[PDB]
């Protein structure tokens, strides 16, 4: 459904796999796409290489 | 979760077809029941009829 | 039949909300009512309780 | 696609008038331009002319 | 049998097919030809290209 | 409805004969009982009695 | 390095919410950015959507 | 699973603090939970009492 679409969208924009993409969406972002992507952009330096599958 | 597993399939359909995530999910849900091959087959049959605005990249297939 | 009436009819017959009803119609069913309903009938055991209640507004 | 939004308007008209999906859409399409209030007004004025088979639930406008 | 005539006339004037022509007549227009055509002219930009089976005729 | 189905037949008679929708319906109603071929046959025999003002397009039976 | 520090925060969320380690980490990652107060705040607001199977101890936020 | 999750899970299961839980995961276990737990069970007698900040669960 929309959760799956939202994870897929975060994965597409950021290049992170779905596991890490889901991490940005869960919690205080509460599946808000803008807040999830923002959190990634702010924390991008701290994301391990294994979490990345593609370029943004 | 199952959402994450479903998300991997949506992302793959989007990569291969060039469609955005909404339309990629459309191909998977329903009679394809998340069968990747059957979803891609549905795109092949319907691609000429997919709205132009629905595409974020060129179809790769 | 319009896309909107097909979604509404699937919603009526199955009891699912419009979001999940649309899911059955798009894709391999390609807006065929019988194939959408068949797919529901096959998958009904695995359909989430959330699919049967209306989605929160706004 | 705006189909889901339209489907919600059809469903609302059906609940209120008791009409099936086809006839509920008739009241919305055209001069009402999918305005719920105008659709319901049209039903009230033309209420006498809707065939009995078109009714799947209780009229409650 | 003026309903069939009215649907046929809207199709001819607008170039739209019969199904969608009927949509313009039913509802708030109450089968008034002018009001149906007004509704078409106002919504024409939003009518899908698929509905048009011919060029509009004065 | 049945109005829409009748309308596609009126439209076809109009296209073929050049008559407006009113006179096109005349050929279909009655003994032709909406049989397209019988309607066109009636036009061919009776064309001489249709007023010229009734014609809005090219005759092309 | 930072994994052990994160682990004590997960352990603390689990203790208070009753959620397993997977779902406890969910509240911490993302917009909370491992802020314990914001993670717990998020749980309190979203408890209804947490699957029952995710709970391995008593809720005591 | 993340390294942090794996440490937290070993801690929950064994009762060891996070520092000693991490010890079981790093090295030849290469962050495999089952081997970490196997190593704990085999070496449990040698773990100092101060390392245990809770009772073991499943």
Numbering used by the authors:
A (entry chain F): 600 to 655
B (entry chain E), D (entry chain C), F (entry chain A), G (entry chain G): 597 to 657
C (entry chain D), E (entry chain B), H (entry chain H): 600 to 657
The authors write:
The Mex67–Mtr2 complex (NXF1–NXT1 in metazoans and small bristles in Drosophila melanogastor) is the principal mRNA-export factor in Sacccharomyces cerevisiae. Mex67/NXF1 is a modular protein constructed from four domains: an RNA-recognition motif (RRM) domain, a leucine-rich repeat (LRR) domain, a nuclear transport factor 2-like (NTF2L) domain and an ubiquitin-associated (UBA) domain. Mtr2 is a ∼15–20 kDa protein that also has an NTF2-like fold and forms a tight heterodimeric complex with the Mex67 NTF2L domain.
The ctMex67UBA fold was based on three α-helices similar to those seen in H. sapiens and S. cerevisiae and there was a hydrophobic pocket in an equivalent position to where a FG nucleoporin peptide binds in the H. sapiens homologue, indicating that ctMex67UBA probably also interacts with FG nucleoporins in a similar fashion. The ctMex67 UBA domain contained a four-residue C-terminal extension compared with the H. sapiens homologue that formed interactions with the end of α1 in seven copies of the eight in the asymmetric unit and which might contribute to thermostability. The UBA domains and Mtr2/NXT1 showed a high level of structural conservation (Cα r.m.s.d. < 0.8 Å), whereas the NTF2L domain showed the greatest variation (Cα r.m.s.d. = 1.9 Å). The UBA domain showed the greatest conservation (29% sequence identity over 55 residues), whereas the RRM domain had the lowest (15% identity over 73 residues).
